[model samples]
Structure formats: C-alpha cells, structure tokens
Target: PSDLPTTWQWTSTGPLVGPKNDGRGIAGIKDPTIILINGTHHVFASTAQSAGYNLVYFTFADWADAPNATFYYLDQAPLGTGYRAAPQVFWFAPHKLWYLVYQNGNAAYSTNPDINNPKGWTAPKVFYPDGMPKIIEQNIGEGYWVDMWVICDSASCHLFSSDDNGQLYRSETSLEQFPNGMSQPVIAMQDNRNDLFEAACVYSLPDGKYLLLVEAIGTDGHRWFRSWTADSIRGPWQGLANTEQNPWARSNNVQFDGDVWTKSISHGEIIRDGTVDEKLLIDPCNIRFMYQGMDPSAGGEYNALPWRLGFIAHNNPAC
Candidate 1:
C-alpha cells in the first residue's frame, strides 16, 4: 500500500512570493516547514544569502490563492555576519515564546506573548539548554553535541527537544529554563552517521501512535531517501526497514509534480487536524532546467532561483 492517502486532497497551495528581485541575489529558497497556531497556518523558509535574513510568514488563506501568494517578513533584528542563517521557526507553547532553530547557528526565541500580535515581536534570546554554561564555542556546530529539535505537544502538555543528533538526549521545560534544565530526550530513533543532518517531521496519528518521518540525503543526483517510524515518543519504534518515496523532488526549480520520486527534500511539516489526518509540505530547490550559463570567476553560476511551495497528502494517515 502506498503512503499516499486516498481521501487526501493534494492541492497546490501556490507559489511563495516575496523579495523576488533578481539583482537582490536571492539565489535559492529551500527547507520549508509549516505549523498551525490559533487556527491559522504559517509557512517558514530559510534564507540562503546575506542580503538579509530569509524569514517569511504566510497564511493558508493566502496560500490557497496560488500564483499570487504573498508573505510577510518576520525578522526585524540585525542580520548576522559571515554566512546566512538558515532558520526553522516553530511555536513552543510550553515555553510561551516563538523559537527559531538554525542550521550551524545559534538558537533564538521571540518575546511575543502569543500568536496574537503579528507585529509586536521581539528579538530572539540566544537560547541555552538547562545545566549548560555560557561558553560561546560550546553553543555552535553540527556534531553530536550540537544538533537539536524542540517539539511541543499541547495535548500531552509536554515539550521534547532531541539533542546530539536525535540520539541520546531530550528535554521538557519552560522556555525560560529550557536549555538549562531540559531532561534527557527519549531516543525515538537511533543515529546513523550517513543519515545525520537530514530533516525530520513528527506528528500524531489517528491510531494514537506518534509518527516520525526522516529523510536521508542521497549521494548521487538531487534525490533524498525517506524512512518512517510509528511508536510512542520514547522507543520501540517500528517500520525502520521500509523506506517511503519522497513525494517532493528536484525538478525545474524544484517544482511539485505530485507523482515523482525526488532526491532533494528538506523542511517538511505535517498538516494536522484533531486526528492524524495530515499533508506534507515542502520547499523544493529551484534548479534551472536549462543551463543558462556559467561564470567561473563568479563561482560558476547557473540559473538557480527560488522554489515553489508544494505538498503531498499522506494516503495512509493510519500509517
């Protein structure tokens, strides 16, 4: 049985539009993650350049409009130097603040009371896990001691942060003392060095089992492999042997085909209702179909651009 659900509607939410000036140096946009807060849907994308921080927000109502979808910039703080920060933002209700986790960068949090004030937002506080020191170097990198995921559950009233690349640590605490007092995260899945640094999505299924989707970047081509598990957050996870086909792939600028196996997949979110009914959302890499040209001096340029917002419905929500 395919994971694609029969009752699901894999509709096109439309292209994400914002800051589309070619000269602005918007090389690409990928790693899209979505979440529902206060009944409204929000989409977050990672910026790839220093022109400015690549943080934008959009609504379901706007997404359904397609071809003309517009997003609002949410980052108002000073942009960092060096490399552009690729951030993944999510609402951590347990902490009562918005958390932004970056790849190879420091984690930051917003002072917004809740999702009510869209405009009244505060700069992020460099988040530190509980029982840790303020050593600056200790706060950065992609090794076992650095990778993390802060997952929140309003139903269970618990928040779990997977540290050490989803291996041997987890945390549950208020946003204020999260980094400092986070308990050891239950090992939902073991770490495989070849599969580390890939994206992961966790959602509750109608059967009451927590489902996790893990993607492994491929060595050749622009494809990514997927593996899933259905078990409680703790352990005894099942279904690691059977890998699922990635619904999103690398095509003309990473467009959504809705029927092709893809190699490059990132930033995915489960559209969850009260039950396990959900759809996977992603931002594919916009690699040009034609070799526009190349400039070795300018880093050997190609016609790479931003990607579109695409999704695939889980045919078997029960899985």
Candidate 2:
C-alpha cells in the first residue's frame, strides 16, 4: 500500500463496479454518474433490478477497464421512469445536449441527452411538475427529495439536493436553460451533526476552488462521506478542514470477502480523468474515487445489498 498516507488516507483501488463487481454483467448498481463520452468510460446508475430504480449504463475503454465494463438496462426502453433513486449526468454546453438529473415522479426529474442510449432516453419531465406546488409545500418532494447533483459555473447552472428534511439544497439555471429554470431548492448544506444525509457532488478545484461531497451518517453506525468548501459557487460553506472525524471518505478499508472491506463507502462519482476540459479536477497523485458498498448484514439502507462499486485513492493537495 506504499505506506498508506498520501496527504489524506483512503487507499484501495480494488473492486470498482457493482452489484457484486462482475461489473460488465450488470447487477444491482446504484446511483452513480460518471461521464466522458467521446473517449468512452460512461457509467450511469440506479437499478433496483431495473424498473423500480431503472436507468443503467456502463461502458469502458480503460479507467482500469471500468470494473469489467459492459452494462445496459434502461428497463427495456423507458417503461416506467426509474423511481426512488438519484441519477445525474451533465454537459449542457449551451444545449449541445446531455442531461439526466434524477429523483423521478417530481424530485425535479429531467431527461433527453440520449443518455448512453437507453432507448435514447426521453421521459421524465417536469423540472418542477408545474411550479413545485409551492416548493412541495416547503421541501418534501418525492420521498423526501434525495440525492441530485448538477454542475456548471461561468455564471449559472447549479442544483444540489438532499432532503429527509435534514437539508442540503441549491438551485439555479442559465447555461441555455438546463434541466430547465431551476431556482427554488435553496438551503446550501445542513443537518449539522445529526447527519441524515444524501448524495451531492460538486468539484472544481485545480486552484479554482469548490468541493462538496455529501452522503453521511456516523454516530457509530458509520457510513461516511462528507466535505464542503467554497471559494465561489456562491456560498459560505466550510468544513473540509483536514477531515478529522468529518470524513471526506470512508468504506473501512477495502475487502469484499476474507479480509473484509466496504461496510459502506457511501454514494459515488468524481473519478473523471477521461478529460473534457480536464474533467472535475482532483487528480492529486491519481485520486480516483467511485463508491458504494454495504455489507454488515445488508442492514443499512441505500436499498441495501444493492449498492455496489468500489475504488478509492488518496492525495489531494487542495486540487
């Protein structure tokens, strides 16, 4: 393990794809959204055996072969619009197109961008389901609205989500009307230490600054993922101070069988080296991270036992 510590702990590059990592064969995959189209390396997720969490995609061409590649299943061409899950994808380069954003039946659904071609994706609409009924009567849409993450910044296009009422929201739109006129989900980040989290990803650090990963819960029943910092994406966010017990990452140390690893590594994303403008930063000594793992008797939600995919690396000198 090269003596571990590379600026900040987290060192395992083992199992990196899910339902049980045969990856290409596709198993219970969870809400992931890795991108890099032209050079391949796609990985969109959420799959409650397809349909309940429908929407899946996996393709590889190196990224260490992306956990064995080959996957597909948009529920045989848009049959029921995935539900109870979070999925996201980007590239709204002024409507040159690519968008998927998720949380179906009105957590602000989105579609169209031919997302990995799952019947060329096209269904979930309602970037508001008609004005969000007054913001869903104060933030509580579709199963308590959960995990959604979109990015942009050259003046607009943002959307972060999380709500089991623990909070973590942010919304906006402009880059040629993406996911379409957002701007209502406000709160930024919250739930103090009670940690009733959700998945939110935002990175742009190469000296430019901005990092915010969510997915938390560590009052003993561990299952970590947390971080926040903002020089500008509009906020007063903070809490990435060397991590401490604040956990910027955690899955208990890599093992799937005999040695035992992954008791929970939390949601996934941020492994973009396929480059589309150098992608979302964080290449500090090859800092790859894509998560999801749950074992302890399948006793911790996340659709339990259904979340899978692993890969963790460290070293981040603020970039």
Candidate 3:
C-alpha cells in the first residue's frame, strides 16, 4: 500500500486504439472500460464516428495487438444505435451475469452471460425507475449527467456518477434489489466544475478503503485525474492526491517510452487483479490505468475530438 508507485511509464507511439476507416467514419476513440478474462483483454469504449457517440467492443491479448483488433460496433447489436458512452463492465457474482453500465441520457445498463460476446448484450434498461432526481435538475445548470459507474459491497450496489456541473452523486440499492430498485441520488462531493469534472471511477481497495478517481481540467488546460478515498461507498470522500502538482494521473507524473503524443489523461479504468466482479477490486501494487488521450493541440467539438487509448503502468521498484 505504501509502496504504490508514485510515477508511471506510458506507452509511446500510442493511440493504442485509434481511428479507423471502417465506413463508420470513426474520428476518435475514448472512455475505455476493460477487463481481462482468460488472458484476453475485453474492452468497451466510445467512438466518435459519423453516426455520433456510440460504443465499440474489441479484444486483444496485448497492447501491440490493440490497433489491429477487430472492432465490433455495439450499435449493430440489440443494445441498439444511440447516445451510449462511458461504459463500466463487471461480473455480478450473485446473478452470474456480466453487467454493462453507461450513460444513455439517464443511467442505463445491459446484461450478458458472456463478457466476450459483444452482440450478446440485452437491450438497454434504465436504472432509475422514475427519472432524473430533483436535486440534479435544480443544480445541473449548464452541465449534463454523464459517466455512470457501479461498484458493490456485500450488502449494497452503489451507482456513482458525475454531472459536468461540478457534482458527484451516488445512489444505491440493496444487493438483492440491484438492476431494479436504485434510490434517488444525493450529492457525494462538490467542487468547481472544472476541478471535479467527469469520468469518475471507484475501486474497492484491499485495505478496506474505497478509492475514487475523477477527471479534472488542469490549469494547463489538459485533462488529468484527481483522487479521493473513503471508508464506505457512501462516502464523505476525503481528498487523497487531488491537485495538479500531485494528481492520480497526469502528464507530469507520466514518462513516455517515446514521443509524448497527448497532454490529456482522460477517461479510463484500472485492470482488475482480483475477482472480476461487482466489487471492482484493483491491486494497488500493480496499478495499470488504461486511459484515453489526444494531441495536446487538437481541438474541436467535444465528441469529435481525436481521443485515443494508451496504458500507463505503475513504476514502483521497491515492490
């Protein structure tokens, strides 16, 4: 725990997952959610294509294979074609089902018996039975509800999300009531909209603490991650390493193997080293963040931005 790497080694000549000319007009790729199963990595990510912000799935055994991995656009599946992005996937042990959670305007999910089957997912279903909560509607002025994440304890499955409006929210349902009866969300953390931006990820640490990482806009105008920790999922999350000078993941703490391709360290997920289940366990000593990045100078519409995927491995020699 104390030996967790303070520095990182990033993949160079990256954009490990890049744009393709497969007739989808895929201009960029971002918002990666990944899991390793049977030695193969299964990834689901958002692609900025002519069709709009939709999802794509692919598999590769190693990072070198990523760019050539066959991409399966989820729009062609029963999940349907629409505004689906920022996906989080995990196996629900109790139900023996693989759950895919994402933002489809509202928090939504789908299930499959197999994580490798991109087309096997069921139709999208909303987690909220009623609609958006009153508090979010009242405070989310120019911001939108996005980047939904789910992690569970023994008793409850917590749904955590961020509104671009500078607020993080959490809702929960008993383990037995999950996939159906989530309660209305309450603000879990608040800050300046830029500092507490979007793409929030929560992991269950072996030390009995929960780790939360949310993306923020650095003063340099690059995207970086800020972290917080809590004893419980329903947290009074105390800032852990949440500043530009000492962030969870940023260009400064990262050294590339080759030329630096991106300044933004955006949305991503940590590789699960324990059981690949709802608990969302990650190994502190072997941390590997699979994040998206883009050319520092690249600028355009948010969706059309040229985002690409890369890996940053924790570099702790002390072990």
> Largest lDDT belongs to which candidate?
3
Evaluation by lDDT, superior candidate among 1 and 2:
2
| lDDT on C-alpha atoms for all candidate structures | 0.40, 0.62, 0.85
TM-score of each: 0.61, 0.31, 0.95
Off by over 4 Å in 3: 1-13, 317-319
lDDT tens digits by residue: candidate 2, 1-319: 1222323556655456665444434346775877655677677777754324666777886767877676666656553544645676665666655666777656545455665576666666766656543553575544366676767776677777776656777777876676677877767766753364777787776667677777776666656776767777667776662242436676543333334545667778876654432125544445667777655565534443556676665644333
Candidate 2 weakest lDDT stretch, 10 residues: 1-10
For residue 183, model 1's alpha carbon misses the true position, in angstroms, by 3.7
Q: TM-score of model 3 relative to the true fold?
A: 0.95
Q: Positional deviation of 49 in candidate 1, in angstroms? A: 2.4
At residue 120, candidate 1 shows an lDDT of 48
**Tens-place lDDT digits, model 3, residues 1-319:** 3434443344334668887877678888889998887778889998875567888899899779998999988887799888998899899999999999998989999999988788898889999857888888987989999999999999999998888989999999999988878888889999999999999999988788888999999889999998888888988787777888778888887878887999889999897755899999988877788899998888777777888898887764325
